[PDB]
Amino acid sequence: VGQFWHVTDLHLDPTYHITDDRTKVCASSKGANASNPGPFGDVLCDSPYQLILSAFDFIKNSGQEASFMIWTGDSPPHVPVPELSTGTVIKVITNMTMTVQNLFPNLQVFPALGNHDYWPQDQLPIVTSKVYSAVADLWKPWLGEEAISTLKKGGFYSQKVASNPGLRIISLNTNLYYGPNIMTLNKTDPANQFEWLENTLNSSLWNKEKVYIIAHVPVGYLPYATDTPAIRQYYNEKLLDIFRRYSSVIAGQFYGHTHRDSLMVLSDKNGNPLNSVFVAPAVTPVKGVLQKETNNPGVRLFQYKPGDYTLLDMVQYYLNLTEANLKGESNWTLEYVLTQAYSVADLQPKSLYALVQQFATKDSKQFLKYYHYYFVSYDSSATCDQHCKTLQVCAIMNLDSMSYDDCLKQH
Ligand SMILES: *[C@@H]1O[C@H](CO)[C@@H](O[C@@H]2O[C@H](CO)[C@@H](O)[C@H](O)[C@H]2NC(C)=O)[C@H](O)[C@H]1NC(C)=O
Numbered sequence: 001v002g003q004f005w006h007v008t009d010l011h012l013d014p015t016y017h018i019t020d021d022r023t024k025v026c027a028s029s030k031g032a033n034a035s036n037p038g039p040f041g042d043v044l045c046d047s048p049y050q051l052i053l054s055a056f057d058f059i060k061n062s063g064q065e066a067s068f069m070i071w072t073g074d075s076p077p078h079v080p081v082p083e084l085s086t087g088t089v090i091k092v093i094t095n096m097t098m099t100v101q102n103l104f105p106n107l108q109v110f111p112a113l114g115n116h117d118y119w120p121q122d123q124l125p126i127v128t129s130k131v132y133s134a135v136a137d138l139w140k141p142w143l144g145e146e147a148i149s150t151l152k153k154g155g156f157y158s159q160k161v162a163s164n165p166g167l168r169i170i171s172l173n174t175n176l177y178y179g180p181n182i183m184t185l186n187k188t189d190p191a192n193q194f195e196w197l198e199n200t201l202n203s204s205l206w207n208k209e210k211v212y213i214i215a216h217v218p219v220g221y222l223p224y225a226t227d228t229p230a231i232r233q234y235y236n237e238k239l240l241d242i243f244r245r246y247s248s249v250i251a252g253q254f255y256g257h258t259h260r261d262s263l264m265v266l267s268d269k270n271g272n273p274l275n276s277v278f279v280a281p282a283v284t285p286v287k288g289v290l291q292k293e294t295n296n297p298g299v300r301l302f303q304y305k306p307g308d309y310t311l312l313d314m315v316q317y318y319l320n321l322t323e324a325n326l327k328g329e330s331n332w333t334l335e336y337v338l339t340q341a342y343s344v345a346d347l348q349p350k351s352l353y354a355l356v357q358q359f360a361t362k363d364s365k366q367f368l369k370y371y372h373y374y375f376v377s378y379d380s381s382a383t384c385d386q387h388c389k390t391l392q393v394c395a396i397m398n399l400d401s402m403s404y405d406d407c408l409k410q411h
Pocket residue numbers: 320321322323377378380
């Protein structure tokens with residue numbers, strides 16, 4: 001089989017350091033006491049360099065063959081806008097990029113921008129910018145002239161996969177659609193990314209290519225909230241229309257941003273499953289003071305059919321953070337293999353559609369496991385009551401506003 005890695009939401013905090021006063025352990029805790037801080041982080045902190053390095057070192061030494069890597073954004077830490085600048089955002093993205101290029105000199109990597117990959121965060125523009133030009137320079141080892149040109153103009157590109165003839169990655173800037181982006185209010189096609197996307201998918205159709213979509217913020221609804229799409233509804237609906245129309249050319253969709261392990265299945269209006277969607281959890285374990293749950297750090301690997309690119313499996317790895325901070329050594333380890341955790345043949349939409357139908361049945365053992373894996377096994381005693389379960393299952397199965405509302409009405 002072929003394989004590729006997916007990492008996301010690294011969120012390096014360069015200030016992390018163990019010290020007696022736990023309000024000074026990390027600037028990303030914003031003056032709150034780090035809860036139980038160790039060398040690999042704290043649930044109230046973003047990622048120490050040591051954690052990010054241990055993730056990439058695990059990947060390097062895993063014994064897993066992989067022909068490329070996708071990397072879907074958010075490298076600066078969660079600190080207030082005035083504590084960052086354009087220069088600091090670039091410096092952190094540069095550090096992450098150079099860590100990857102130093103450790104994996106021969107591995108093509110396909111990055112996407114996250115909402116924090118800009119100063120101020122979330123305000124990614126629809127014209128060229130310092131950050132777009134800087135990441136064009138940084139990612140030039142992996143990208144050709146046309147990809148570099150679109151990246152500098154609007155933060156998006158497509159690129160052939162050198163090691164996989166007939167495969168093309170489309171890296172969208174979905175931060176252009178993200179609610180907090182005040183640079184794009186009421187634009188029908190910001191940075192002309194929809195037109196471009198349609199043009200690109202058309203060319204892949206006629207060049208007999210398969211396409212993997214990557215982006216930071218995903219399509220669909222947030223599974224912990226009621227009727228809250230991850231990007232603005234207008235843009236979610238327009239993007240999903242493109243994806244449905246081209247669902248025979250797109251062989252997978254891969255997102256980050258939510259810092260959780262989630263599945264979605266894009267269907268049409270009449271319940272026919274069309275395309276599979278995978279949201280990967282973060283390397284950072286950070287959470288706010290009030291939140292009950294967070295994720296363990298995660299990285300994941302996809303297996304696909306050579307020369308075909310049908311998705312065959314997904315292996316999710318994780319770092320048990322409490323364990324690693326208690327002994328001072330990481331033990332990145334397999335959390336689950338999707339086919340064998342869920343007893344499904346593969347990652348095709350039919351397989352995942354049937355699995356979600358299983359999730360919806362009462363006391364489903366599969367949904368209980370899924371919900372535990374949602375937080376990357378942070379809390380094995382975590383409960384999802386009927387309202388919580390309806391929100392998760394409806395967001396998994398229904399990406400568009402109409403079918404999602406239908407789903408909630410019936411549940
Ligand atoms: C991650 O590691 C921690 C630490 O070993 C595990 O938590 C321990 O679980 C045992 C068994 O229930 C408890 O008796 C200990 O009190 C726990 N230790 C701490 C420090 O909380 C945890 O179960 C591991 N996570 C997973 C998913 O296995």
